Every structure is written in structure tokens, then in C-alpha cells.
mmCIF file with all atom_site columns, C-alpha atoms in Angstrom:
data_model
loop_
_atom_site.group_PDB
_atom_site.id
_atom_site.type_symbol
_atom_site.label_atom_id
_atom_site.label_alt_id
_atom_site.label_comp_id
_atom_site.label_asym_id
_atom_site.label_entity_id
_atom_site.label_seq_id
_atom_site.pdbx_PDB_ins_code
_atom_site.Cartn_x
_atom_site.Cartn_y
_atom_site.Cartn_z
_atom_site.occupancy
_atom_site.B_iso_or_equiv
_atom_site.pdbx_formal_charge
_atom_site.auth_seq_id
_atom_site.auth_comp_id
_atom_site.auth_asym_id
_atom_site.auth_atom_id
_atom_site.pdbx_PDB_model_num
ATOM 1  C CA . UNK A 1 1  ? 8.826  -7.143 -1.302 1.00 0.00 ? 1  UNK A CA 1
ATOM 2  C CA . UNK A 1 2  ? 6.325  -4.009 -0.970 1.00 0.00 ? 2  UNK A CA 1
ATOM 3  C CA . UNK A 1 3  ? 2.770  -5.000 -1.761 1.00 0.00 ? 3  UNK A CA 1
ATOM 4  C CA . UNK A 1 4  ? 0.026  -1.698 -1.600 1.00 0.00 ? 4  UNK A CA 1
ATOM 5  C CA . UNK A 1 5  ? -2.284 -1.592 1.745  1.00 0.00 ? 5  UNK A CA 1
ATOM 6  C CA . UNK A 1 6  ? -5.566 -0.651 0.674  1.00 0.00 ? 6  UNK A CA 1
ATOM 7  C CA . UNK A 1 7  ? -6.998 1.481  3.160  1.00 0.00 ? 7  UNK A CA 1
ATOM 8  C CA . UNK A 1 8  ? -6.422 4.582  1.187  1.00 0.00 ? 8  UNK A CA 1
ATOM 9  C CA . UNK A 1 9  ? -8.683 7.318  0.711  1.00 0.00 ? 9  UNK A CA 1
ATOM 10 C CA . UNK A 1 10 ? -6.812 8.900  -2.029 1.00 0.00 ? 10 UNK A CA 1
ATOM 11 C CA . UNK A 1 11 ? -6.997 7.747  -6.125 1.00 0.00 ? 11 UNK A CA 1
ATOM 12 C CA . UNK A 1 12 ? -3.121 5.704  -6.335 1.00 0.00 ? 12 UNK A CA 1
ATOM 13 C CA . UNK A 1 13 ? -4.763 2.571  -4.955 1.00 0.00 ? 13 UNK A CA 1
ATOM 14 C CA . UNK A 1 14 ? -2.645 2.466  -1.915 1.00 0.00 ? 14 UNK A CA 1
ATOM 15 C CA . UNK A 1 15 ? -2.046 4.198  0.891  1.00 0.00 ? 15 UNK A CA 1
ATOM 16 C CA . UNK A 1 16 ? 1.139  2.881  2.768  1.00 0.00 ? 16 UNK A CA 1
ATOM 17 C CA . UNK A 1 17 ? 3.450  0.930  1.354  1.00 0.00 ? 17 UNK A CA 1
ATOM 18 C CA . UNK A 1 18 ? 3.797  -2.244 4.323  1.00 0.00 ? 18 UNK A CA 1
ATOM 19 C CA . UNK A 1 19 ? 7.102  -4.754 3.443  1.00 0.00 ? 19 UNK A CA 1
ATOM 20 C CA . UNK A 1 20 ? 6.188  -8.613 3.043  1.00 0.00 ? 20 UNK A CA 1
#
């Protein structure tokens, strides 16, 4: 399942996708 990383800098709340 893809759950959002958060260390984003830009405004979509993720940054990389990471697969859990």
C-alpha cells in the first residue's frame, strides 16, 4: 500500500510516495 512521506517542501502533502 503507498502511504505519503511527509518531508515535502512543496503544497501536495507528500513528497515521495514510500510502499508499506
Amino acid at each position: 500500500r503507498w502511504v505519503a512521506r511527509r518531508d515535502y517542501r512543496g503544497d501536495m502533502g507528500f513528497d515521495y510516495w514510500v510502499w508499506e
